[PDB]
Amino acid sequence: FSRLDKVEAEVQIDRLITGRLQSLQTYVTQQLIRAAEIRASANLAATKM
Amino acid sequence: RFASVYAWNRKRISNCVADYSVLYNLAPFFTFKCYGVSPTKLNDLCFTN
C-alpha cells in the first residue's frame, strides 16, 4: 500500500487475499476428512470395550 | 553538457535527503512513467542507494 496508488493496489492485494483465503479452506477440508477417520476408530474402540 | 549515448555518465547519490517535489514540478517534463512505484509516493520512502 505504501508503494502503489490506490487504483492499482486493489489488484495486487486481491491476488494475495484470494491465495491466503484458499490456502485456509484447504486446511479445513483436510481436517473434515481426518475427523471422519478418527470417528471410524472411536466407533471400533467403543465396540472392543 | 550531457554525455553521449555510448558513454553515458553515472552519478552516485547517497547520504542525503531527497525532495522530489522540485523534480515533479518542472514544466517541460513529457515522458515520466514509473514501474515499481507510483510517482506521488516517492516522498515517504527510504532507498538503499
UniProtKB/Swiss-Prot annotation, chain A:
Range covered out of full length: 981 to 1029 of 1273
Official protein name in the record: Spike protein S2'
Function: Subunit of the fusion protein that is processed upon entry into the host cell. Mediates fusion of the virion and cellular membranes by functioning as a class I viral fusion protein. Contains a viral fusion peptide that is unmasked after S2 cleavage. This cleavage can occur at the cell membrane by host TMPRSS2 or during endocytosis by host CSTL. In either case, this triggers an extensive and irreversible conformational change that leads to fusion of the viral envelope with the cellular cytoplasmic membrane, releasing viral genomic RNA into the host cell cytoplasm.
Result when mutating T47I: In strain: Gamma/P.1
Domain of life from the UniProt record: Viruses
Gene that produces this protein: S
Annotated organism of origin: Severe acute respiratory syndrome coronavirus 2
Taxonomic lineage of the native organism: Viruses, Riboviria, Orthornavirae, Pisuviricota, Pisoniviricetes
